[PDB]
Design a protein around this ligand. Structure first.
Ligand code: HEC
Ligand code: HEC
Lengths: 158, 160
């Protein structure tokens, strides 16, 4: 069962329930370490849809129909009873990518990258390749996904 | 109703949980060794999960039910710079800690929570901790029922 919902023009409707998908890793790019303006502020919590997680465990590959959501959250504090560091605050928005060789035959890896203006937007905005795909293609460890930062994926593959 | 998550010995000790990466993630924080005198208490990234049945009850009530299992998975800092910018990026898994709320198994523990450490991922079972080792700090500073929900935006957004 596919977890994306799409328009006739193959655009990703804003995913619902992705926090109940399979978490694959979190990173943090604080504003204060990125000239007071991180590209994706600031914590990133990343999810893969459950069907594609199942296929990943079987094959170590992203199936046609894979949806990955990167959820952004602010840095809420830098010190807690557990020590110094970064601790999350409030949610900021999402980014997403969808793999589909039928809908996206001309895109690298058959991935479409979606930006979201806000959580109330009805749909994502598909991006031209220089804005997202170029960086992922140049630097991601596996099939345009930064699996070097997803220890769940690396431990879960066969 | 949902399944009960976690498995327990006859002495009510949590057996080392399996499949928790398919539970509901509730938030991640990072205490890097380099910001904690080269030795964070829990090195270093923490990815936290609540079992799915207790997540369902949380969405309905904003409370942790009897049978709640929360797992905090530790991972290293793998790096501090990537194409997305400077910060902290995870490395390899380090270990787990857990807490279980159960008024029947742990009637005399603060909040009916049992705190478990794990010697390694290969250990058969956790080691239940004394109150001063874990519960004291959680009770003193956690925002809700001994859980640090100030750092779990998924929980705060999911409660009614
Ligand atoms: C995180 C991301 C994800 C998660 C899947 C993944 O491959 O990591 C999505 C869906 C996404 N981005 Fe990309 N991005 C970059 C890196 C290094 C990471 C992982 C580490 C971290 O969380 O900080 C990402 C890198 C880059 C990049 C390098 C210069 C660019 C220009 C972009 N990303 C751009 C975009 C998008 C353009 C709008 C977009 C929709 C993204 N990323 C989606
Ligand atoms: C994270 C933790 C979790 C996850 C649930 C939670 O309430 O956040 C577990 C299951 C657990 N710890 Fe505790 N802990 C502290 C803090 C602030 C955080 C959240 C922020 C972060 O991830 O860094 C925790 C704090 C403290 C603490 C304060 C001085 C003490 C001494 C301990 N924790 C101790 C313990 C454990 C004793 C061995 C134990 C099993 C823990 N924590 C479990």
């Amino acid at each position: 069962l596919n977890y994306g919902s799409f328009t006739k023009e193959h655009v990703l409707l804003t995913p619902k329930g992705y926090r109940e998908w399979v978490f694959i890793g979190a990173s943090v790019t604080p504003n204060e370490l990125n000239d007071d303006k991180a590209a994706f502020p600031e914590f990133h919590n990343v999810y893969i849809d459950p069907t594609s997680w199942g296929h990943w465990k079987k094959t170590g590959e992203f199936r046609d129909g894979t949806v990955i959501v990167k959820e952004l959250a602010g840095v809420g504090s830098k010190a807690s009873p557990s020590g110094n560091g970064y601790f999350p605050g409030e949610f900021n928005g999402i980014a997403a990518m969808v793999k589909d060789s039928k809908r996206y035959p001309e895109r690298p890896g058959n991935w479409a990258f979606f930006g979201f203006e806000s959580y109330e937007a009805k749909q994502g905005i598909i991006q031209t390749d220089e804005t997202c795909a170029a960086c992922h293609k140049e630097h991601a460890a596996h099939d345009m996904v930064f699996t070097q930062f997803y220890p769940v994926l690396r431990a879960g593959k066969p």
